[PDB]
């Protein structure tokens, strides 16, 4: 209601104006620059920035006079150097931009914030990395971890494989935070025979806030791209304070918190190491793939007609009939406890196997391992031919099944593959110090 009205009286966003309005019978006079409407609301209100910087709101109906003093002083549209002159004797690490922003410029006068992925920007914004390696920013695509599909993971693997095999010492993927753990699991299975560091990294606090965890995460991540660890890892704060990051093995990481930096944790397995922006490192494990010269081989194949179904008291078999019915080849059921399902639903699962669907079992209890022999319900799910996925993260098992169904459609074979340990995905046994950490 205001967008048009403004235009009607011939006004442009940014024009310096002087509004007069009525409030409880009497005149109130303002003077500011017309600002854009709230990112999500029809307006019976107009936004005006005063010569204070303070944004104010005015109700249309109350506006009696809205003169224009100065007009939209639109300007420049500055540009930055994509890549920058490297340094002698420093590794080449290419930062594949997946959409997760690691820096940003903010126009105070305008109040707008623009992402930043240009080397000339990452330089002034985050110098630290350039005294560790020659950073090569590579725009793959701007996307939110929220709406990212398997196909994207693929476009990632290649670009990593490429740059990596194209001489780069290590790669660093700047992904969004919401889905990072899914992505991580993806590349893990995709980058077959890897001999160099692959690092997913993002910020919990937006790049613009002085308190962003973006910087430290980047530094730590690059120092790792530069490490002797030959596998896909996620590098995020380890604690809440600016201390050290943790490098988790990309098949045992889950976002465990809605907004904290501690958000990412290793599950059912220990992290790989602690890194400090400072440079010191501390492996927490000895069994990690080491640096080599082997060429990374991307493995595309993935059947994405697979769904993840979380069980709960009161689910109807209809939810599963529907899936079989719409031609889903795989179902990763994230069930209850040791890996159970309500018995009133074991038949719809029994039927999904008969229709040659791959049904995998994991548990809603993020930590722990699935074992279907103990209790009767489990044995029943076993008979129906359900595939127990040991201690594999429910999200990881989802990604995995797609990949594995992208190789076979034969269940006996899907069993072996699922249960085969290509990455840290599964564990021989559960360590006591592997829970709630």
């Amino acid at each position: 209601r205001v967008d048009e009205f403004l235009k009607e009286r011939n006004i442009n966003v940014g024009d310096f104006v002087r509004i007069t309005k009525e409030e409880d019978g009497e005149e109130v006079t303002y003077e500011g620059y017309i600002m854009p409407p709230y990112e999500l609301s029809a307006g019976d209100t107009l936004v005006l920035k005063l010569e204070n910087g303070y944004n104010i709101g005015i109700a249309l109906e109350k506006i009696r006079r809205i003169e224009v003093l100065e007009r939209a002083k639109v300007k420049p549209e500055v540009h930055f150097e994509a890549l920058i002159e490297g340094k002698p004797g420093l590794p080449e690490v290419t930062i594949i931009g997946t959409g997760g922003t690691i820096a940003s410029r903010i126009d105070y006068e305008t109040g707008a914030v623009y992402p930043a992925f240009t080397a000339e920007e990452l330089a002034k914004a985050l110098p630290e990395i350039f005294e560790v390696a020659n950073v090569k920013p590579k725009l793959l695509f701007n996307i939110f971890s929220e709406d990212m599909k398997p196909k994207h993971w693929v476009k990632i693997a290649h670009e990593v494989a490429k740059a990596l095999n194209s001489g780069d010492y290590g790669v660093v993927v700047a992904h969004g935070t919401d889905t990072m753990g899914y992505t991580a699991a993806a590349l893990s299975f995709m980058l077959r025979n890897l001999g160099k560091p692959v690092v997913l990294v993002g910020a919990q606090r937006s790049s613009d806030r002085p308190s962003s965890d973006a910087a430290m995460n980047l530094i730590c991540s690059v120092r790792m791209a530069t490490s002797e660890v030959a596998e896909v890892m996620v590098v995020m704060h380890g604690e809440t304070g600016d201390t050290y990051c943790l490098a988790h093995r990309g098949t045992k990481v889950r976002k465990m918190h809605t907004s904290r930096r501690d958000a990412f944790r290793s599950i059912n397995d220990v992290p790989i190491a602690k890194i400090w922006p400072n440079g010191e490192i501390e492996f927490l494990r000895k069994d990690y793939r080491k640096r080599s010269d082997e060429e990374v081989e991307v493995d595309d194949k993935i059947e994405e007609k697979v769904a993840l179904v979380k069980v709960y008291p009161g689910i109807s078999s209809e939810i599963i009939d529907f899936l079989v019915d719409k031609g889903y080849k795989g179902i990763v059921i994230e069930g209850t406890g040791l890996g159970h399902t309500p018995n009133d639903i074991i038949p719809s699962i029994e039927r999904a196997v008969e229709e040659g669907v791959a049904v995998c079992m994991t548990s809603q209890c993020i930590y722990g391992r699935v074992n279907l022999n103990v209790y009767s319900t489990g044995r029943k799910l076993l008979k129906a031919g359900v595939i127990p996925c040991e201690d594999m993260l429910p999200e990881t098992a989802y990604v995995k099944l797609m990949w594995v169904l992208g190789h076979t459609q034969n269940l006996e074979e899907v069993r072996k593959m699922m249960l085969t340990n290509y990455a840290g995905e599964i564990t021989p046994y559960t360590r006591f110090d592997t829970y709630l950490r």
Binding site: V47, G53, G57, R105, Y108
Partner: protein, 508 residues
């Protein structure tokens, strides 16, 4: 009868007032309780931000260079993620918002139709997120006064910063309990043209605040800052004005200070001395003081210190000239010098402190001073001494120009003291986490009609309606016992005298 004809001297005064609301923290359902229990701690570092065109704020950049870390103290019960910067804020807290609105109307302000929150950037580390969430809530209010109406351009509701526990070098420790407590800021306009008028605005606003009866009461809970000026002087920010009753004398003493400085500058201009005539060359005089009887200098030397001089052309009898009762131009010099040194000696104040005429003439000589030229000493390690003498030179220079813009603090004297340089303009930007808050016309009205009665309006009523004696009426109010008093009578009880007397007098 005033001291100066404040109309001739273009006296301009402004008022800035911060006050905490006794509500929950502004952006999280947390008790605005303070606690000396620190159960855990976390360390953090803040980092500047590029401008639309890759620039880094010098100040914030400068602070980055100091390589200091911010340690924050908090307890498991009063510290939430929002004030740890580990969860998005929610707000503003409705109670605080309304109290703001109320205060607005109560001050003839016109509340905004829709509120938008800003992020004022903050370097200190006193704000864990790097910024202070602020917002304008009302505008163009006004306080009537004997000298004419004074305006209130802005009323804002913002977050107060964390408490500082210690500023070690390369590590400032802050406590989180205070971070988030709602703050209402009320700002005058640079037109108050009389000391008294100031106290009046200051007092009215203070009272509007008491009225709301949900504004924190206590020690460090009220900020009354002034900004004085004179035709041909300079805008001087005066922090820490303790009690309302000092406002008139402080403003008066300041006008005096500035008035005198100008008189001095004029004498200087007349003698003809330009800032360039004050060369930053330091004469080593540690010799003329090898065997002096000044305990001060003597110790400095024995520890390996030096006595450097400074030649200040035509500054004689002007360094010792009084600018405020008990303060001289040299007190300003010394003040600025204090950044590196405990004190300074200058030609107008001695012979004294153990320095003989001999020592004085010996210096007048090695510096080749005229009868108009003067000098200024400093006894400390060679470098410190220089930096101090530099700081003094900058001031002697500024002195020939006029009144240096600076932020001074209030003294129990009614005098001011240099404190730091005026703060730079703040950088602000949209707090996109908090949705715009639409203030319904029904809420504004439903609030605008039920405004509390000012404290004085009460004292006056007590005297009319209830007839009780004034001394009783006021004392009931001036000693915050006005709340209870109202309670007794509500019972149709103790008419007024009984109640009033028993309280104000009996229980005392």
């Amino acid at each position: 009868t005033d001291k100066f004809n404040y109309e001739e001297l273009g006296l301009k005064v402004g008022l800035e007032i911060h006050r905490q609301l006794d509500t929950k923290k502004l952006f999280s359902p947390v008790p605005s309780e303070l606690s000396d229990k620190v159960e855990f701690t976390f360390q953090r570092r803040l980092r500047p931000t590029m401008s639309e065109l890759g620039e880094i704020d010098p100040a914030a950049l400068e602070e980055f260079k100091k390589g200091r870390v911010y340690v924050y103290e908090g307890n498991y019960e009063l510290t939430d993620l929002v004030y740890m910067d580990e969860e998005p804020p929610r707000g503003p807290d409705r109670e605080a918002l309304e109290v703001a609105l109320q205060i607005a109307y109560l001050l003839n302000a016109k509340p905004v139709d829709e509120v938008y929150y800003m992020r004022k950037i903050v370097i200190d580390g006193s704000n864990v997120s790097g910024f202070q969430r602020t917002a304008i809530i009302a505008t163009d209010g006004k306080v009537e006064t004997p000298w004419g109406a004074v305006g209130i351009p802005t009323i804002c509701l913002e977050e107060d910063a964390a408490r500082i526990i210690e500023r070690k070098d390369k590590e400032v420790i802050y406590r989180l309990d205070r971070l988030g407590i709602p703050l209402i800021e009320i700002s005058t306009t640079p037109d108050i043209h009389h000391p008294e008028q100031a106290k009046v605005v200051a007092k009215f606003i203070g009272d509007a605040l008491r009225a709301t009866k949900k504004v924190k009461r206590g020690l460090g809970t009220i900020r009354q800052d002034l900004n004085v000026s004179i035709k041909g002087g300079a805008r001087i920010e005066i922090k820490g004005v303790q009690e309302l009753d000092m406002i008139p004398i402080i403003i008066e003493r300041e006008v005096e200070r500035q008035l005198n400085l100008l008189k001095i500058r004029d004498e200087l201009r007349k003698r003809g001395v330009k800032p360039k005539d004050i060369k930053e060359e330091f004469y080593d005089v540690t010799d003329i003081f090898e065997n002096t009887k000044s305990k001060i200098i003597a110790r400095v030397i024995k520890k390996g210190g030096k006595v450097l001089a400074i030649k200040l052309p035509k500054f004689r009898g002007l360094i010792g000239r009084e600018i405020q009762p008990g303060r001289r131009l040299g007190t300003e010099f010394a003040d600025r010098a204090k950044k590196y040194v405990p004190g300074i000696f200058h030609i107008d104040e001695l012979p004294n402190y153990g320095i003989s005429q001999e020592e004085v003439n010996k210096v007048i000589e090695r510096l080749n001073l005229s009868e108009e030229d003067a000098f200024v000493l400093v006894a400390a390690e060679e470098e410190k001494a220089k930096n101090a003498l530099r700081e003094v030179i900058k001031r002697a220079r500024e002195a020939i120009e006029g009144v240096p813009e600076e932020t001074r603090r209030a003294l129990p004297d009614g005098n001011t003291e240099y404190m730091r340089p005026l703060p730079g303009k703040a950088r602000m930007y949209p707090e996109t986490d908090i949705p715009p808050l639409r203030i319904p016309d029904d809420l504004k009205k439903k609030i605008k009609e039920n405004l509390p009665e000012l404290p004085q309006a009460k004292v006056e009523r007590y005297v009319k309606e209830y007839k009780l004696d004034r001394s009783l009426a006021q004392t009931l109010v001036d000693d915050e016992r006005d709340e209870l008093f109202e309670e007794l009578v509500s019972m149709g009880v103790k008419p007024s005298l009984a109640a009033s007397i028993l309280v104000v007098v009996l229980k005392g």
